[PDB]
Structure 1
Amino acid sequence: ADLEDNMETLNDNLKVIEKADNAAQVKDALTKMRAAALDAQKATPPKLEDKSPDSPEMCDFAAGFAILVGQIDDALKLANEGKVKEAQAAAEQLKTTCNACHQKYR
């Protein structure tokens, strides 16, 4: 998909996880998020469209999602051990990485 749809997915599923009743729900959402994270990792954001893929800015962008995925995976790992609560805790922490990048590039 494209970037906006990716960020929708990311946002919706983050709400789901806040809302989640069991571990399968959370595993599911996190899995959806992972997919979008990775898709988005190769999109070129509007604000950066005039910069070469080489640039500090574009690399930083892509690094964002590298961090984002890693954190998702830590949460995935937690939801896999059935630890719904600690896993929602980890999703909350995502919000940091969202904002940090939104600050720079949204």
Structure 2
Amino acid sequence: ADLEDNWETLNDNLKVIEKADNAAQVKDALTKMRAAALDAQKATPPKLEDKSPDSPEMKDFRHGFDILVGQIDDALKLANGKVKEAQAAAEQLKTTIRAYNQKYG
């Protein structure tokens, strides 16, 4: 249950931010994101061997997870004394979940 959990983790992560109230819980929050994000890389709950395989050696698949670690990477920096900046970005991350559905869609 590390896959169904990561989702709740990426989700339960963004909540600790807006509610972090302190830069300390922000690192800890995004620390768990960029962490499970690198784990969800090999994510395949629906099986990518039974739908659109794309073509980029699937590289384009991990790139979406690695690229994601790129925006979360710069935010992990704001964490880590820029909370409101990190928190506001959290709403940007919430939007990533939407663009991620275009990946999971």
Q: Does 1:43 align with 2:50?
A: no
Provide the C-alpha distance between the structure 1 equivalents of 2:30 and 2:48, rounded to a whole number of angstroms: 27
Question: Aligned residue pairs: how many?
Answer: 105
How far apart are 1:74 and its partner, in Å? 0.9
* Aligned residue in 2 for 1:88: 87
Provide the C-alpha distance between the structure 1 equivalents of 2:53 and 2:70, rounded to a whole number of angstroms: 22
**What stretches of structure 2 of length at least 5 have no aligned partner?**
none
Change (3 A) 1:50 1:57: farther
Report the structure, 1 or 2, having the larger helix content. Answer: 1
SS at match of 2:91: helix
Change (3 A) 1:41 1:17: same
How far apart are 1:83 and its partner, in Å? 1.2
Check the 8 A contact 1:41/1:65 in 2, yes or no. yes
Stretch moving more, 92-101 or 41-50: 41-50
Identity fraction in percent: 90
| Aligned-pair Cα RMSD in Å | 2.5
Q: TM-score, normalization: structure 2?
A: 0.82
How far apart are 1:90 and its partner, in Å? 1.8
How far apart are 1:89 and its partner, in Å? 1.6
**What stretches of structure 1 of length at least 5 have no aligned partner?**
none
